[PDB]
Design a protein around this ligand. Structure first.
Ligand SMILES: Nc1nc(=O)c2c([nH]1)NC[C@@H](CNc1ccc(C(=O)N[C@@H](CCC(=O)O)C(=O)O)cc1)N2C=O
Ligand SMILES: Nc1nc(=O)c2c([nH]1)NC[C@@H](CNc1ccc(C(=O)N[C@@H](CCC(=O)O)C(=O)O)cc1)N2C=O
Lengths: 325, 319
């Protein structure tokens, strides 16, 4: 039984009617099981996480996109999270009995069909990228929605699928394939400027080719959320096996400490693979010379050390993918 | 108007119908406003926190006791928290426009009416104690429900109010007056014995912490142990100190602390004092009270077992 995870992000995190309509589009698609919907009002973005056979998740992603096309007007969208499209990024991840190559095929099929139906520009990223410059989502997203009109007039920005036209209500969509990614935000009582400084010091790309960051396979930016009245170092762990949750958290804490800024827990966006939490547990057990044999205790430990309950209760059975599937 | 806080503990933490019946008894009493109900299945105990005018809270506590008398059978009760009565302890605390002396009078009034109306033995503790030996609840509760039959036969244990008879379904009740007390539990991934050993080294009665009582137990529903403490005077020994000391003792045994839990309500200053501790330790500067509270909730891990909502847990935010 082949299983692929699809984690599309949409530029709407305030209007519950719109959020729910997109949820129904996914959940009502044959073969698709919606596992999570995580929306934020200040970030003004929602990530949907669902699974199913390769061909089924492609159909689910398209049904979601079609609903979004009617309900989201990018010309009026603003939020803390970077974005350039109503359906900003649509990734396909291999979960079981599926190769990364097939997921790339799913991304290509999805992208082609999305572009054809809506007449919008679509870019391929990650393992589906046609060129090294399009591998990175932040690179493709540079300048955001506001920069599209100018970018679309340049040959180098010719989309992988669709016309090089600026469609006000939609913008541009990025589609691709990749391994599991962890969207992890670290809370700090600081200014957005201080949080961003830390983000730039830690993210692999740093401040530029001549100014690399400290952590490999980590993307990050800093912001402030009116909703929670606090700043966050928002990160993406592209390969937790290379750089895990504990490492990103501990390094952020260190940098914050150097500036006399306090870290106050964290927030996982969407779902997380069990191993990412167990890897972190192993780290703290070694650092603290602990001895635990139960996974529930390992998880309880990590949840407390990273402060994953800070903004809302962290329920393992609802957040760990292996516990949901 | 005058305001007194009453925080009675009842020996029932599993049967929701019984817990709710007692909540209704309090909430339906004129002048009483129920602010919190905290029930635990392992401790098999529920703490009710309510406020109202002096006489009103006495009536509320009595209505709660009458409901409990018909719904709780102590001959079948067992739990992690020490206990000797269906309504185990009933404290009265001054909140607004009331002196400790008046609260002592409320404790005495409640104690006598309870004893004579239900026909049960009642002891006075805290500021209402009739003798120095009864100021301490742990001393009066020594031996628990199981020791009552024998204790009641001794002149030394004659109740302050009521008959000296052993009432199987009820046991005995302790009533008194005191300043705000903080019920604070620290979570440990350890055995019950290890948690209790730490409790013994930390409690003043031994210990290292002045004005702190402590015992160790296990929460089967959460699969973790807790060093359960009572901060009798947070101005002397605060939340930060109790937490940090427990952490230190646990580290000595390679046992990890995983947050904590406050039972009931807490005065704003107790949280702000703790915030100041971490700000000193970490060289921080935080202008906002919201941030100072957020800092302590994270440092102490107060959201470990359930969300800690300041507006629903801080006295000054509820008054
Ligand atoms: N109450 C609340 N407030 C928030 O601000 C908030 C939450 N909830 N929920 C989750 C999230 C809002 N939603 C999202 C959705 C996705 C990403 C995200 O990082 N997506 C990556 C995906 C990369 C990929 O798939 O390759 C991105 O870079 O686009 C950020 C925020 N969030 C707080 O963030
Ligand atoms: N699900 C859950 N599980 C729990 O075990 C838990 C909660 N919730 N809530 C309630 C509480 C269990 N009950 C209690 C009851 C009282 C004290 C307590 O320290 N009371 C003092 C009062 C002193 C006085 O008023 O003078 C006492 O010594 O009687 C501790 C835990 N608790 C927590 O793990």
């Amino acid at each position: 039984s082949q299983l692929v995870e699809c984690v599309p992000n949409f530029s709407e995190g305030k209007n519950q009617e719109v959020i729910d309509a997109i949820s129904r589009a996914v959940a009502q698609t044959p073969g698709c099981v919606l596992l999570d919907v995580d929306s934020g009002p200040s970030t003004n973005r929602t990530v949907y996480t669902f699974v199913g056979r390769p061909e089924d998740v492609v159909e689910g992603a398209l049904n979601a996109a079609r609903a979004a096309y009617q309900l989201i007007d990018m010309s009026r969208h603003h939020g803390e999270h970077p974005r350039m499209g109503a359906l900003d990024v649509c990734p396909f991840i291999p979960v079981r009995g599926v190769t990364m190559d097939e997921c790339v095929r799913c991304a290509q099929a999805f992208g082609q069909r999305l572009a054809e139906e809506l007449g919008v520009p679509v870019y391929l990223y990650g393992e589906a990228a046609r060129t090294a410059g399009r591998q990175s989502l932040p690179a493709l997203r540079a300048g955001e929605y506001e920069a599209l009109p100018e970018k679309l007039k340049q040959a180098e920005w010719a989309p992988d699928f669709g016309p090089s036209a600026f469609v006000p209500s939609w913008g541009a969509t990025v589609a691709g394939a990749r391994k599991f990614l962890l969207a992890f935000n670290i809370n700090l009582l600081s200014t957005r400027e201080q949080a961003h400084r830390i983000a730039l010091d830690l993210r692999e790309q740093g401040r530029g080719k001549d100014q690399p960051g400290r952590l490999k396979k980590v993307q990050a930016i800093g912001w402030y959320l009116d909703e929670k009245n606090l700043a966050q170092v928002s990160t993406n762990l592209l390969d937790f096996e290379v750089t895990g949750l504990h490492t990103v958290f501990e390094e952020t804490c260190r940098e914050a400490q150097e500036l006399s800024l306090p870290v106050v827990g964290s927030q996982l966006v969407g779902l997380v693979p069990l191993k990412a939490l167990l890897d972190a547990a192993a780290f703290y057990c070694e650092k603290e010379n602990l001895f635990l044999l139960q996974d529930e205790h390992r998880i309880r430990l990590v949840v407390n050390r990273l402060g994953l309950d800070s903004l809302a209760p962290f329920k393992p059975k609802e957040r760990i993918i292996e516990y949901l599937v």
